[PDB]
Design a protein around this ligand. Sequence first.
Ligand SMILES: Nc1nc2c(ncn2[C@@H]2O[C@H](COP(=O)(O)OP(=O)(O)O)[C@@H](O)[C@H]2O)c(=O)[nH]1
Ligand SMILES: [Ca+2]
Length: 306
Amino acid sequence: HMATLKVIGVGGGGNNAVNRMIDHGMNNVEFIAINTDGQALNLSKAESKIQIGEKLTRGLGAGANPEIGKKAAEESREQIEDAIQGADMVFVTSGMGGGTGTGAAPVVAKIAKEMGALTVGVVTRPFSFEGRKRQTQAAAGVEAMKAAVDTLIVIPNDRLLDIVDKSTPMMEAFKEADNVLRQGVQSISDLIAVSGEVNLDFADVKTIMSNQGSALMGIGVSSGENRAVEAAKKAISSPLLETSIVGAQGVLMNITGGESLSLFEAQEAADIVQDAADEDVNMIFGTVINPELQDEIVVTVIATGF
Ligand SMILES: Nc1nc2c(ncn2[C@@H]2O[C@H](COP(=O)(O)OP(=O)(O)O)[C@@H](O)[C@H]2O)c(=O)[nH]1
Ligand SMILES: [Ca+2]
């Protein structure tokens, strides 16, 4: 069994994320670009493109009206089903607050789930400087997304203001937001690709991610003294995420290391997760020994059940 992973960008922000991921290089993942904006879709690098709402917009964006994105997606339902068909997992990514993302992304998520895919949303909330109407349409979209998906990761754009200095280029800040999706996707590809010593597979991802609500995905890398504890802390850190580790009741944790990976280190990492949660966590634990590695340890966490 080799699970089919698809990433679907919906609207401007969603498609920017897809474009920056394709640009960065990513294999065994199919990308789908969905938009009302024909100008933007023409410049997309995605292998499969769906223009929605040509009747409604005549190839322009939806102009900040979420009912137009919704109706656009509904009328292109069969084209969307066809593009998804055969996926085992779908990541739907979108910026909430606009017309197309806000309205179309939950429809896409709903179609994905009813095609049988494990469906994860990764969405942004607008910057506060964008104003209250934007924030309020965004919140309606987030609730709609939450209803449609299996699990939802929310990245408030205001959090980007916590990781920049006064000169950090906007595109560099956006790339940091993109990493949440990219590394979440990559960590699932990696789990599926490798047969670990204590193996985790797609059915374990399904157990943790299916019909939950909020989620956290994370990866942390470290080496040398305290590598396991530091990799675990990095894995659970959530500066850009609305949903932190606290209150997590289920965690999929994988530790990858060289032949030096110690049992003691494995427990240290697991206990960082347990203790940061402040709940009695139901852990799905895995380990991979990759003899090509020297002193590096990688800890992967997916946490749900808040
Ligand atoms: N982090 C991030 N946020 C974005 C990006 N593009 C747009 N946004 C945000 O997403 C919201 C909706 O924008 P957009 O997706 O272009 O609207 P739509 O195409 O009408 O859905 C904006 O109000 C911004 O908060 C991006 O590339 N990165
Ligand atoms: Ca595996």
